[PDB]
Design an enzyme around this catalytic site. Structure first.
Site, PDB file in Angstrom:
ATOM      1  N   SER A 126       0.788  -1.214   0.000  1.00 56.37           N
ATOM      2  CA  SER A 126       0.000   0.000   0.000  1.00 56.37           C
ATOM      3  C   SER A 126       0.836   1.288   0.000  1.00 56.37           C
ATOM      4  O   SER A 126       0.234   2.381  -0.186  1.00 56.37           O
ATOM      5  CB  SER A 126      -0.955  -0.059   1.183  1.00 56.37           C
ATOM      6  OG  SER A 126      -2.001  -0.993   0.898  1.00 56.37           O
TER       7      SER A 126
HETATM    8  C1  PNM Z   1      -1.926  -2.184   1.551  1.00 57.91           C
HETATM    9  O1  PNM Z   1      -0.897  -2.836   1.699  1.00 57.91           O
HETATM   10  C2  PNM Z   1      -3.283  -2.630   2.077  1.00 57.91           C
HETATM   11  N1  PNM Z   1      -3.337  -4.060   2.238  1.00 57.91           N
HETATM   12  C3  PNM Z   1      -4.074  -4.843   1.361  1.00 57.91           C
HETATM   13  O2  PNM Z   1      -4.723  -4.384   0.425  1.00 57.91           O
HETATM   14  C4  PNM Z   1      -3.993  -6.326   1.677  1.00 57.91           C
HETATM   15  C5  PNM Z   1      -4.217  -6.722   3.111  1.00 57.91           C
HETATM   16  C6  PNM Z   1      -3.187  -7.336   3.810  1.00 57.91           C
HETATM   17  C7  PNM Z   1      -3.391  -7.714   5.138  1.00 57.91           C
HETATM   18  C8  PNM Z   1      -4.621  -7.478   5.749  1.00 57.91           C
HETATM   19  C9  PNM Z   1      -5.650  -6.866   5.033  1.00 57.91           C
HETATM   20  C10 PNM Z   1      -5.449  -6.488   3.706  1.00 57.91           C
HETATM   21  C11 PNM Z   1      -3.630  -1.861   3.351  1.00 57.91           C
HETATM   22  N2  PNM Z   1      -2.432  -1.343   4.025  1.00 57.91           N
HETATM   23  C12 PNM Z   1      -2.205  -2.107   5.255  1.00 57.91           C
HETATM   24  C13 PNM Z   1      -1.255  -1.299   6.082  1.00 57.91           C
HETATM   25  O3  PNM Z   1      -1.138  -0.093   5.723  1.00 57.91           O
HETATM   26  O4  PNM Z   1      -0.688  -1.917   7.023  1.00 57.91           O
HETATM   27  C14 PNM Z   1      -3.558  -2.363   5.944  1.00 57.91           C
HETATM   28  C15 PNM Z   1      -3.554  -3.505   6.970  1.00 57.91           C
HETATM   29  C16 PNM Z   1      -4.147  -1.097   6.561  1.00 57.91           C
HETATM   30  S1  PNM Z   1      -4.567  -2.899   4.519  1.00 57.91           S
END
Ligand code: PNM
Length: 635
Positions: A384
């Protein structure tokens, strides 16, 4: 004339066999032993070449300016210039004279001692003296040592001064209990094949104070390669190993008595660090009196290498990973100086280079977390954190309105029914989502919808302005970052996943720090730099200053907002703009990510990650220490 051409062929086959190390095939091309023919026989020529060329590590014999004529009826004079590589350098401009022989239907070489070296005659000898070059040091940006040669307290045991039977085992128990050693290893070292009753059998190296020495224990100070930070920089710095006979065959200018870099910077900067071997390659009288000197020059020690690494930041960045799988990259984003390139888990470079047991080396090679991998140079899906790139691209091409508020209901979404059952997923169910909200809660559906609205062509136009496919001018083995596998996504699903950094994207932590430097230079990309004296290279107009002035305020809220994904970092009380991420790796293996820098002074930037994270573990939980250091020392 027809015989002059066959003679030119034998001169080239003779020098080729010498060039290939096959001194025997060249011997079988000479004439019979006689007065004006060959001075020596075949087996004597094979030995004289093997002794002399083998002593000087002669390699790569090449000739030029061949002149072959005709003296009388059966002898053809021939001359040429030649050059060769030795362990003392390059012997260039060698005037080789000689005569051939064309009895029967073939051509042989009237071998003479002047065919080993020009001014040789009779039973002349060759002498070679060499002085090793001390290996240069590797230092951080402030002069602290990272790789040095120094004195080491080597602990070893002598079998005779140990005892006869009962007292021998009691001292073994004492030495194994005074230096933190195994009782089965002390008896395994003193019982090898090379051991004699009166030999100093070495054990380990004491990296601190020397305790009381039991009966049989003795300290012998010897010089070797030392790494102060140890495992905290083992992947980056590397280690040196004993030079083998195969290394000398590939590069004769090495010191078969010395060490060669096997990985990391020790190998990448081997030529600059090892120096040049000095000495003299001379021809002597039949008794040994010096006659003619061929090569001579003083020993030139290796040059030091000054890195942009901060030694204190390198240790802190590594320790904060708690021995788990991951890596951290810290830069001064305005100049690109790589302050820290930590990778975990790691191996002991001191134990690796000062004599490593065969059992410990297997543990390093079979550890599933793979300590030898330089994870800061390994390509990963960015997760992300990549939303900053996607958002900035949408701002630049007029696809994102920062104040425009999308209405997203639920935790799943798909463009239309053609996506089957795949759905972009978010973690926070927020109905009203703008750019500021999507970055705070890390909303994938906002990123996916706005990526599909932007389209593939507009998406790649902004991506191509970065460093996808570029080879960074860094002394680190590394593959270039890639957008996808091919030049086209050819899938709206893959297009959406690339939007929030979970497609076929592959960007290593160093390349991520390079791509994210745009948010510390008003949209200018600053390439990372590892050598301190090297010039700062940049890349203007990667993203617009409008997008930077829009996203960086939102990244402040990813830390400061109560529901921000990095809100635990607000405890530091320092100006922080950050963006977290958790990448799914297809059981469910996750990679935690953290991007963070100082948005007030742009003094430092940080990209940390955990590979195959444990539960409730993240890079954000471990950055408080490194961020406090970089905030105080890099403004
Ligand atoms: C970016 O990496 C996002 N994650 C996903 O789209 C996949 C995901 C992975 C694990 C649990 C749920 C979804 C978002 N960014 C992270 C972060 O910033 O740590 C989140 C857990 C907020 S989802």
């Amino acid at each position: 004339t027809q015989a002059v051409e066959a003679g030119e062929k034998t001169v080239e086959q003779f020098v080729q066999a010498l060039n290939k190390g096959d001194y025997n095939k060249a011997a079988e091309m000479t004439s019979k032993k006689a007065a004006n023919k060959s001075a020596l026989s075949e087996k004597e020529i094979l030995d004289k070449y093997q002794n002399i060329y083998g002593a000087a590590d002669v390699k790569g014999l090449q000739i030029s300016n061949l002149k072959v004529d005709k003296k009388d009826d059966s002898t053809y004079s021939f001359s040429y210039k030649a050059k060769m590589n030795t362990s003392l350098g390059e012997l260039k401009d060698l005037s080789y004279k000689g005569t051939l022989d064309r009895n029967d239907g073939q051509t042989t070489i009237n071998w003479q001692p002047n065919l080993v070296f020009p001014e040789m005659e009779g039973n002349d000898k060759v002498s070679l003296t060499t002085q090793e070059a001390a290996r240069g040091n590797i230092i951080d940006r402030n002069g602290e040592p990272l790789a040095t040669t120094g004195k080491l307290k080597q602990l070893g045991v002598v079998p005779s001064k140990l005892g006869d039977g009962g007292e021998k085992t009691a001292n073994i128990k004492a030495i194994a209990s005074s230096f933190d050693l195994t009782e089965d290893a002390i008896n395994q070292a003193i019982s090898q094949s090379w051991v004699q009753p009166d030999y100093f059998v070495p054990l380990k190296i004491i990296d601190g104070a020397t305790p009381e020495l039991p009966a049989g224990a003795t300290i012998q100070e010897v010089d070797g390669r030392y790494y102060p930070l140890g495992e905290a920089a083992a992947q980056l710095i590397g280690y040196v190993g004993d030079i083998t006979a195969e290394d000398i065959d590939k590069n004769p200018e090495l010191s078969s008595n010395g060490k060669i870099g096997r990985s990391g910077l020790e190998m990448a900067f081997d030529k600059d660090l090892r120096g040049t071997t000095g000495g003299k390659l001379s021809i002597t009288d039949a008794d040994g009196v010096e006659k003619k000197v061929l090569i001579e020059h003083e020993v030139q020690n290796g040059k030091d290498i000054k890195l942009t690494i901060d030694a204190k930041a390198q240790k802190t960045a590594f320790d904060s990973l708690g021995g788990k799988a991951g890596s951290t990259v810290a830069t001064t984003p305005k100049t690109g100086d790589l302050l820290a390139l930590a990778s975990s888990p790691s191996y002991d470079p001191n134990k690796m280079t000062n004599g490593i047991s065969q059992e410990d080396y297997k543990a390093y090679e079979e550890n599933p977390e793979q300590p030898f991998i330089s994870r800061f140079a390994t390509g990963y899906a960015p997760g992300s954190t990549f939303k900053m790139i996607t958002a900035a691209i949408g701002l630049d091409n007029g696809t994102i309105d920062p104040n425009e508020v999308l209405t997203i209901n639920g935790l799943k979404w798909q463009k239309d029914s053609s996506w089957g059952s795949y759905q972009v997923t978010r973690v926070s169910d927020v109905s009203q989502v703008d750019l500021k909200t999507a970055l705070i809660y890390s909303d994938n559906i906002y990123t996916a919808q706005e990526t599909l609205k932007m389209g593939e062509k507009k998406f790649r136009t902004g991506l191509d302005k970065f460093i996808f496919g570029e080879d960074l001018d860094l002394p680190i083995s590394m593959n270039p970052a890639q957008i996808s596998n091919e030049d086209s996504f050819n899938s709206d699903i893959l297009l959406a996943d690339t939007g929030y950094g979970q497609g076929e994207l592959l960007i290593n932590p160093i390349q991520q720090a390079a791509m994210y430097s745009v948010f510390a230079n008003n949209g200018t990309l600053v390439y990372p730099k590892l050598i301190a004296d090297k010039e700062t290279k940049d890349k203007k107009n990667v993203i617009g200053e409008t997008a930077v002035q829009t996203i960086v305020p939102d990244l402040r809220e990813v830390v400061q907002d109560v529901n921000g994904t990095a809100h635990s970092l607000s405890a530091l009380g320092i100006p922080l703009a950050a963006k977290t991420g958790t990448a799914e790796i297809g059981g469910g293996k996750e990679n935690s990510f953290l991007f963070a820098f100082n948005p007030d002074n742009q003094g430092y930037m940080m990209v940390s990650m955990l590979e195959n994270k444990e539960d409730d573990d993240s890079a954000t939980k471990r950055a408080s220490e490194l961020l406090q250091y970089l905030n105080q020392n890099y403004q």
